[PDB]
Subunit: 283 residues, 4 copies
Amino acid sequence: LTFESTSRFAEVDVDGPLKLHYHEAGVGNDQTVVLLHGGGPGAASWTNFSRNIAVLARHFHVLAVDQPGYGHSDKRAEHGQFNRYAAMALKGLFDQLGLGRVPLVGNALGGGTAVRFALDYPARAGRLVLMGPGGLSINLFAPDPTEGVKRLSKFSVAPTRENLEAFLRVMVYDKNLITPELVDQRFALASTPESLTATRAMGKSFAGADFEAGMMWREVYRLRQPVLLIWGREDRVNPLDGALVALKTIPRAQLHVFGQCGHWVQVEKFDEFNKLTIEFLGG
Amino acid sequence: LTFESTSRFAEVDVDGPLKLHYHEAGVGNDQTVVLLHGGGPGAASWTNFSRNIAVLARHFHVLAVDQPGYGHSDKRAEHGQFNRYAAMALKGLFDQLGLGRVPLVGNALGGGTAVRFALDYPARAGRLVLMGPGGLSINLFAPDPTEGVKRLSKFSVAPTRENLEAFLRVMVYDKNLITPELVDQRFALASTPESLTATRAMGKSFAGADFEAGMMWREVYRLRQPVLLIWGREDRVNPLDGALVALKTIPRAQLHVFGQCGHWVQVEKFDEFNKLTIEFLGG
Amino acid sequence: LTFESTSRFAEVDVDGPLKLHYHEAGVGNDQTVVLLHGGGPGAASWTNFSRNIAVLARHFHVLAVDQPGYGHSDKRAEHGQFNRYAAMALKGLFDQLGLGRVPLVGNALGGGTAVRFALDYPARAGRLVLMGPGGLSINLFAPDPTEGVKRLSKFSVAPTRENLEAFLRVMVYDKNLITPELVDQRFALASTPESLTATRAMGKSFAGADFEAGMMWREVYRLRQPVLLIWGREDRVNPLDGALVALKTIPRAQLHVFGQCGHWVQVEKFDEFNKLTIEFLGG
Amino acid sequence: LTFESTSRFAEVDVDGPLKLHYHEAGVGNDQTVVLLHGGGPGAASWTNFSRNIAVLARHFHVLAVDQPGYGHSDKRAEHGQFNRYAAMALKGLFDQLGLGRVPLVGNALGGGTAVRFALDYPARAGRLVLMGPGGLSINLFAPDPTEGVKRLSKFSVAPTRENLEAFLRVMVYDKNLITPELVDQRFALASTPESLTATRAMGKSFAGADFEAGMMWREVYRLRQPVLLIWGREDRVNPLDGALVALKTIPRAQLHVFGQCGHWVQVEKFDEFNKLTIEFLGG
C-alpha cells in the first residue's frame, strides 16, 4: 500500500462542486470503514493514519478521507461551522459511493466531524470510534483555549517553523517523536498558501451564527449506536476531562484511556489502538 | 471444567495455619494467572468467575482463589486490615506453589487484595487487571458509604433474604439478572454461621489501627507494572469517580469503562471483559 | 414572623386558575427576593426555609412561594414538565405583583424551577442562588436514579412512615437531625390524598414529550447573570458531580461547597448559607 | 500603610541563620493572621497582597511574610523540599514572635507552605485559607507540567522579558491586567542574580530524595481544622481539578470557585476574596 496506489478523488456537492481526496484499501473486505483524520494544519489522511491503514485494511475496506481544507481535498476560503461542512461533504461521498450505514473512526477534528455526521444523518452512521475528539468534548476543568489550541492559534497568526514545532510538541507524550524530519515535513505542507487559506477560513468560521452545531456535547444523548471513546491520559489539546459528558450521556458508550499517551493516540499507542478498533468494529 | 474437577486446597501460614480453597484450570499453559473475587457475603471464586474461568483457561494456567473468609477458605473470627491479611495468605500460596512474579485479576474487594499484594510484595506481582476495585479507589464525588456499601452493611446487621436481594440489585445494571434462583443461592451461603462470623470479622477490622493499609490510593504511584482498570459506568458500590486518583498516579495505567454495566463487570460484560484481559495479559 | 402572619394567596393563570400560597416578609425593604423550596413530598416554603426567612427578611423583601403541588398551593392531578409548569405559575405571580427583574433562591426541585424561569423569561430573573439544584445538574459520575431519588420513588409507591424516614435520612449529613418529630410531621403532610395526587402527577410528567425542558444543563450557557451554586459535599440526592457542567458553562458562575453537609444546605449550614446569600444578593 | 512602614526583619534558624523579611499591619487587633504569597520569580508579600493587606488589617493583626528565596528574605543557593524548608522558617518566626496557634492564608506556592506547616507543626496552625494552592493539589485531569508551570520553567532557563510576559499572561483571566508596567516591574525583580540563584535552587530541590513531602494530597486527611479552598475557574497554573482530593479528604473542608478568574484570586476577585477570608477567619 502506498500513497499513490490508494489515492482516489471524488467530486461532491456542498453548495457546489467540492473535490475530495481519499485513500482506499482493503477492497474486497465486506465491511467498509471510514477514517477521519485530525486537524493540524499540515495533517492529512496518509500521515495521520500511517501506523493504521495497512493494519485495518487487513480486516476492513478502508476509506481514509482528507477532510475539506486538508491534504488534497479542496481548500475553500470560506465555510460555515467546519464539522457541519465536512459532514455535508461526507454525505455527498457516501451517496456517490453507494454506501449505506458505515462505521466511522475519527480523531480530534475528525472525531467532531464523525459525530456531526452521526447526528445530522443518523441513519448513515454505524459504530463510532473517536480518539481525543473535538465537538462532543467539553473541558469541564481545563481553561479554554487549551495549550494545544492556543499553540495552533499562534502558528495560524505566525506561520514559522518554531511555532509549528512548539505545536507538535504538545501533540505527543514522548516528545522524542517530534523529530526534525517530522517538523520539516509538516511545516512544508502547513505553510503553503492554500493551507494558510484553509486556516484563515477555519478562523472565520469560529465566529459564525451556527456555532451551536459545534457544541455537540448538548446532542450526543441522541446517538443510538455503540461508541468507543479513546483518550490519551496526557492529551494537551482535548484533555481527558472533555470525555465526561459524552461518556455519561451516550447510552452505549465505552471509554478507553491510555496512560503515557498524548493527543496522537493512533501513533503513540498504534498497536493497542489498532486492536481495540478491530475488535470493536466486529472484525 | 467443574467446581469439583478444579477444586484445590492449600495450607499456608498467616499467624498460624490458614486453609485456602482454590480452583486450578489450564494446567500446561505457560503463563499462570491468579483471580481474586469480589466481596459479597455469599461470593466465591466459582460463582464470581463463572463466565470467565473456562475462557481464560484456554489461554492461561488459571488459579482462582477463595479469599480468606469466603467460599471454602478458612473463615476466621478476627483479622487485621482485610486486604493486608488476604495478601499474606496469597504470599504463602505463591511460595508454596513455587510461583514467582504472576499477573493478578481482581474485582471489588479482590482488586483491593491484588493491589495490597502488589505493594507489599512488589516483586511477586506482574500486570494487574482490576474491575471496580476497592482500596485504590477513593470516591471523589460520591458520599461514603455508597448505596452499595450501605446495603451490604444492612444485610450484615439483618441477614434476611429481603436485604440480600436489595444488595444484589445494586450489583448490576440489568436488574433482571437478579433472579429468584440467584437470590436463594447466594442467601443460603451468605447466611451460614461461618459467613456471619466472617462478616462480623470484617466489621471489626474496619476500626483497627492499621486502617492506612486500606487507603491504597496514597500508594499506587509506587507501582511499576502496567495496570488495566476496568469499570462499569453504572457501578453503585465502587462508583466511577473512584478510578481517578489511580488512573492519574499509576504511571502505566489504562482505564476501560463500559456503559450499561454495573459492579459485576465480569458478568454483565463477560465477553468484552474476557477479551480485554486476554489481550492485556499478552495471551 | 409566623406561618400565619406571612401567609398570602394568589390566583394566577396556568392553563386556567391556579392558586398559589406564599409567605411575605420584610415588606419595606427595597430589594425583593423570591425563594423556591425543595421537592420532598411533605415539603413547603415555611418548613424548608425556617432557618432562613426571618434572617433574609432583615435585608430583603422576602416572597417564599409554595410551588404547585406543595404546601398550600394547588395540587393538580396532571401537568407537563414540572419545572416549566411551576415557572409559568411564577410568571403569573410576578406579573400580578408587578415585579420586574428579581433574584431567585432555589434549592433542589426549586432550583430547577428558578433556572427554568430564568431561561424561559430571561428578563425577569436576576441573580440566582441555587442549592443542590435539579435540572441544571447532570450527574457525570453517580448512577441515576441516585439513592436519594430512588428513596423518594419508593415512598411514592409505598407511602409508609418507614419509607419516609429512610428518605429523610439521606437528606442530611447529620442523621440526628431526622428526629421522630420531624418524621411524624413530614409524614402527616406527605401522606394526605392531595400530596399523593401531586406525587402521582409528578410521576406521570416524567414520561412526557417535553422532557428536554428538564435537561437544563444543555441551556445554562445562555444565562447572563451572576449565579451562585451552593452544594453540600455529602449531597446524596443531587450529588456534587452534578455541579460541573453548570460551573463550566455559566459565564458568571461561582460555586461554594460545604464539607459535612447534605442535601439540605439551608438547614445544616444555615448560618453560612444565610451569609453567602446576603452578600451575594448585594445586601 | 506603606512597604516601608510595615517592613520588618527577623533572623530564624533553619540549618543556621536565615533572614526573613515581612510586613506587619493591624497591630492591636486581637487575632493575628499570617499570609504566604505565591511563587512567581519576582513575587513578594507586598505585591502579591496589595489589594488585601490594608483591608485585612482592618480586622486582624497581619503578618505578611516573604518566603525564603523571595522578596527581601534570604535567597539561599540550596535547600530541600521547598515547602518543608519554608515551613521550618515559619516555625522559627512563630517561636520568636511568641505566636501560638495562628490561621494561615496562602496562595499557590504559599498555600503549599501553609499546608506543610499545618502537617509538620499541627498545633501551631489554625484555620487555613488556600488560593489555588500547590502541594495539596493533584491535577487529576490536566497533564503535568501545566502550561503555567511550563512557562515558569521556560523563564527559569531563559530569563527574558518576553518569557516573563508569557508567564504572567497565564496568571490571570483578564490579560489586560498584564500591563507593560507590571511586566517591567516583575522582570526587574525576577532577573536579579539573587532571584536567579533562588530559581536554580528551586530547580535542584525538585529532584531531592524528600519529594514525598511535596505530595501533600496524601496527607491532608490528617488536618482537623476548617479549611477554605478558593479557586479561580480559569486557573492555568494549578487548575481546578487539583482541588478534588483535598475537598474530599479534608473533613472540615469548604471550596469556593470564582468564574472569570485566574490563578491570582486575590487580585482578580480581591473584594470577594477579602470578604470570604474575613468571614471565615471569624472577623
